[PDB]
Design a binder for this molecule. Structure first.
Ligand SMILES: CCOCn1c(Cc2ccccc2)c(C(C)C)c(=O)[nH]c1=O
Lengths: 539, 415
């Protein structure tokens, strides 16, 4: 009993051939189980006894699971898979709890062995051939081939989903106020109908599937809310996070610390406060995965503060398309941002944070701009709309910055919300030379090969200085020349250099850099009442 | 009937993923595609077709009507060549050109059955609660290069009668568009264009440029009562950079005025020798560099620099420092707070000029981060084609130099 569903035309990769891997040897026991199982499937209609007309072959194996300790079977399609054509990506962008609309009911149907419910392209069938061994390689073993989507075969998931979509089209046209979500072997049918009308509609869907061959599930196996969707539990009324457990031990290997640092990192997206600085710190200079690193007092401590935060009940809300979508952002440390998207105050749909993106050189506004875009991309996917933004940056700071930056940049509809620390412009290089202020003509030169160089300046006022550096580079001297000018001058300074890097500093005006040296220069820049950087061609 | 199109030797169809779409857009594409599906132009497809080409919806000006735009850039590139119409040099010397979307005419012609797989596209669904809706084309797709080609006999056929009735008007076809240039006055021009549309409508089909105005603009250098150490330093740096273009540009005499550790604000008296040098520089910059010609067998390139305050500069070239054309773009009314809009608008303007002048779109170097562009350009896209692009970091001096371009005395006076 299979299906009156049209098959999908399947082919092999560019001019290849089907697998011809030999049948692994098995005992009379393992064989007798497989023989049993294959006489059954031979009748369910799923496979078919073949003969000498088929050079193809895949290795069949015998494993006993736990459910019944019963001898089961496994066909190793790795080869056939690496030879089967490419299909269009099966669903790899899955729903997110924050984007689900709440429903009066959701009922999960099991289209379990639905792979074996869908016919195989009769043309492709020969490739799925396998052999039931004989008692220690005796006469010919029993030969077969699949007549349905094989478990573990490459195209099954894609073809199963498609087949399900065609079959489901009628039902969906006939009652649009019903949302069906296809995932793996489940159908999450939900709706806003009266629980009785709902149960009724599901029975119809079930009976509809019956027409097409999908045998109805047992009450024992049925799934009931809350549903687990990786880190979350969806309850009809809202979602919660799955209990995340940090195990207490007296011996932590590097593995345990890495696996731990992982789970914790995942939690930083949901729980407010998670920290792994002292845990990561235990990784320094490790010589093996199995290496036991003792937890310092400080690691012990943060681990404990974590166990505490993680025992808080972070819950959430579902999406209501008639309410505003709002996204607020907080600069949580330099380069780190936290955000939470909601519609109604304190009822979050989603929260999360972006790691300290350690780049070669930016500024807060640019970075705020980037967090805003990542969020926007997220929202389009999740909700197909972009959130109104509430940003901890004054509208004046944004106009002054974006309007003059060399790069195109933007922030969608946003509004200012004062929730310190507010992001701002740490310094703004002067637009024109400072009259009055001292001028430093700076210069640094190094021997790229001996890495011995000098750095200094001479000012219109007479002051001067030179410093010798070892294990430097020319860029470092050029930059250190600038550094000294800043250190040695008053609150208003004019600095001239032929450093091409300083020309980049003048355009972008970075407030964070990959270089400690440039960093120090930033701390000085920020410190002055006025700075004017003037670049001039070298030589 | 159907002509056997194919892919270039060794090429495989596009497998470009669908960028996420807004709900407004998915809803329209859905509407639009069920229709196309009913009319027989596109057909739902299976998972055995591994290809894909991004789709999105744009706005047909004056209407709420959403238009579908497929990004066939990858397919086009992989599609065999058919060696379009030779570019009419006359088109640039026309007082006023108008653009028309004749892309609607292709649905009439069928697509080689064996090529259709390659036109696969997908409509996403919010939160991915629904699998994408796959379709492929049964007809000539809009935005594919192969369309205007295959539909050429039919296009010239319908066009002749008008071309002869009005032999002073030029008609050029790029992709789904038709640019019609004439030296007639605005009214007589447009009335003559609508005459063309009526003509075009009795089969099945439905921007105001002024090419002769596109002035080649030079670099004007600063002049001053007195010059400061800084002014000179600023000038010397631009001139030194500019010597990669005009090698006769010199800063030695000026550079001597910069000998000394003096205050940036201090005024320096210009030596006559320094003053001749500057005057000789102004003379050099008075005209475009010599020997720059367009090589048809070379990629055309368009670089843009954000000048700030809604201003933008660009230069179309093929070889570094050998410009075919330079210009400025001031934002359009309404674009006040949005850089991406100003940018996409600029790219569209620049791209139509390129089409108008050399009959091909350039490859852009955009002063924007990849993600800012990819996330929002469609929102403001209005042309049927889409040029190629790369994201770049604007060198501080390239910007500094082109900002020096000459602007009008008062401006193009529209009384
Ligand atoms: C009981 C709540 O489950 C979550 N839920 C669901 C089911 C659901 C279950 C697992 C993964 C995705 C979706 C749906 C759909 C897909 C029926 C819905 O619309 N709203 C909702 O809250």
């Amino acid at each position: 009993p299979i299906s009156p569903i049209e098959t999908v035309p399947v082919k092999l990769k560019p001019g290849m051939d089907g697998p011809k891997v030999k049948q692994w040897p098995l005992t009379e026991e393992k064989i007798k189980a497989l023989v049993e199982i294959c006489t059954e499937m031979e009748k369910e209609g799923k496979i078919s006894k073949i003969g000498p007309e088929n050079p193809y072959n895949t290795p069949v194996f015998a494993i006993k699971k736990k459910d019944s300790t019963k001898w089961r079977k496994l066909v190793d399609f790795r080869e056939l898979n690496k030879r089967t054509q490419d299909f269009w990506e099966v669903q790899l962008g899955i729903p997110h709890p924050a984007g689900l609309k709440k429903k009066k009911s959701v009922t999960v149907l099991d289209v379990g062995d639905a792979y074996f419910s869908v016919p195989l392209d009769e043309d492709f069938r020969k490739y799925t051939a396998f052999t039931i061994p004989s008692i220690n390689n005796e006469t010919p073993g029993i030969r077969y081939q699949y007549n349905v989507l094989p478990q573990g075969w490459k195209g099954s998931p894609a073809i199963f989903q498609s087949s399900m979509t065609k079959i489901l089209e009628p039902f969906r046209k006939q009652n649009p106020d019903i949302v069906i979500y296809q995932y793996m072997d489940d159908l999450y049918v939900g709706s806003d109908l009266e629980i009785g009308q709902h149960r009724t509609k599901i029975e119809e869907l079930r009976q509809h599937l019956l027409r097409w061959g999908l045998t109805t599930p047992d009450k024992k196996h049925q799934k009931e809310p809350p549903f687990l969707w990786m880190g979350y539990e969806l309850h009809p009324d809202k979602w919660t996070v799955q209990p995340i457990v940090l195990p207490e031990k007296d011996s932590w290997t590097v593995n345990d610390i890495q696996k731990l640092v992982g789970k914790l990192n995942w939690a930083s997206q949901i729980y407010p406060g998670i920290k792994v600085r002292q845990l990561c710190k235990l990784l320094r200079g490790t010589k093996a995965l199995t290496e036991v690193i003792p937890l310092t007092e400080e690691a012990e401590l943060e681990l404990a503060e974590n166990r505490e935060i993680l025992k808080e009940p972070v819950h959430g809300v579902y999406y209501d398309p008639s309410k505003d979508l709002i996204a607020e952002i907080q600069k949580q440390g330099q380069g780190q941002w936290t955000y939470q998207i909601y519609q109604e105050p304190f009822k979050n749909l989603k929260t999360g944070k972006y790691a300290r993106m350690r780049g070669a050189h930016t500024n807060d506004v640019k970075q705020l701009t980037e967090a805003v875009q990542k969020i926007t991309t997220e929202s389009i996917v999740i909700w197909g709309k972009t959130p109104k933004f509430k940003l901890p940056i004054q509208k004046e700071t944004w106009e002054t910055w974006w309007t003059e930056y060399w790069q195109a940049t933007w922030i969608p509809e946003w509004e200012f919300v004062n929730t310190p620390p507010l992001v701002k412009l740490w310094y703004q290089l002067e637009k024109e030379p400072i009259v009055g202020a001292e001028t430093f003509y700076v210069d640094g030169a190094a021997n790229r090969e001996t890495k011995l160089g000098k750095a200094g300046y001479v000012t219109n006022r007479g002051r001067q200085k030179v410093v010798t550096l070892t294990d430097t580079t020319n860029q470092k001297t050029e930059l250190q020349a600038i550094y000294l000018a800043l250190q040695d001058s008053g609150l208003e300074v004019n600095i001239v250099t032929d450093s091409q890097y300083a020309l980049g500093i003048i355009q972008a005006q970075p407030d964070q850099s990959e270089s400690e040296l440039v960093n120090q220069i930033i701390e000085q820049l920020i410190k002055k009442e006025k700075v004017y950087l003037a670049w001039v061609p070298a030589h | 009937e159907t002509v056997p199109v194919k892919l270039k030797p060794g090429m495989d169809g596009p497998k470009v993923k669908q960028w996420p779409l807004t709900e407004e857009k998915i809803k329209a594409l859905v509407e639009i595609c069920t229709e196309m599906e009913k009319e027989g132009k596109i057909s739902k497809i299976g998972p055995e077709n591994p290809y894909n080409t991004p789709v999105f919806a744009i706005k047909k000006k004056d209407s709420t009507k959403w238009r579908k735009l497929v990004d066939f850039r990858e397919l086009n590139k992989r599609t065999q060549d058919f060696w379009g119409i030779p570019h009419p040099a006359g088109l640039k010397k026309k007082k006023s050109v108008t653009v028309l979307d004749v892309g609607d005419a292709y649905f009439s012609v069928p697509l080689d059955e064996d090529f259709r797989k390659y036109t696969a596209f997908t409509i996403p669904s919010i939160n991915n609660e629904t699998p994408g809706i796959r379709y492929q084309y049964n007809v000539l797709p809009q935005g594919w290069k192969g369309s205007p080609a295959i539909f050429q006999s039919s296009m010239t056929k319908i066009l002749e009668p008008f071309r002869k009735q009005n032999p002073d008007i030029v008609i050029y076809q790029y992709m789904d568009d038709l640019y019609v240039g004439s030296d007639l006055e605005i009214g007589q021009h447009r009335t003559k264009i609508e005459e063309l549309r009526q003509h075009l409508l009795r089969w099945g089909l439905t921007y105001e440029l002024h090419p002769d105005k596109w002035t080649v603009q030079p670099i004007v250098l600063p002049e001053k009562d007195s010059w400061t150490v800084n002014d000179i330093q600023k000038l010397v740096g631009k001139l030194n950079w500019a010597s990669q273009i005009y090698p006769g540009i010199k800063v030695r005499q000026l550079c001597k005025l910069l000998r000394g550790t003096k205050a940036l604000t201090e005024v320096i008296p210009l030596t006559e020798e320094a003053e001749l040098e500057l005057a000789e520089n102004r003379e050099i910059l008075k005209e475009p560099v010599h020997g720059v010609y367009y090589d048809p067998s070379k990629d055309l390139i368009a670089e843009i620099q954000k000048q700030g305050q809604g201003q933008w500069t660009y230069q179309i070239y093929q070889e570094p420092f050998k410009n075919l054309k330079t210009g400025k773009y001031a934002r359009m009314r309404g674009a006040h707070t949005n850089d991406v809009k100003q940018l996409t608008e600029a790219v569209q303007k620049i791209t139509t000029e390129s089409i108008v002048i050399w009959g091909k779109t350039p490859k852009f170097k955009l002063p924007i981060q990849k993600e800012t562009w990819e996330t929002w350009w469609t929102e403001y896209w209005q042309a049927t084609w889409i040029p190629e692009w790369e994201f770049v970091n604007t060198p501080p001096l390239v910007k500094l130099w082109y900002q020096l371009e000459k602007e009008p005395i008062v401006g193009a006076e529209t009384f």
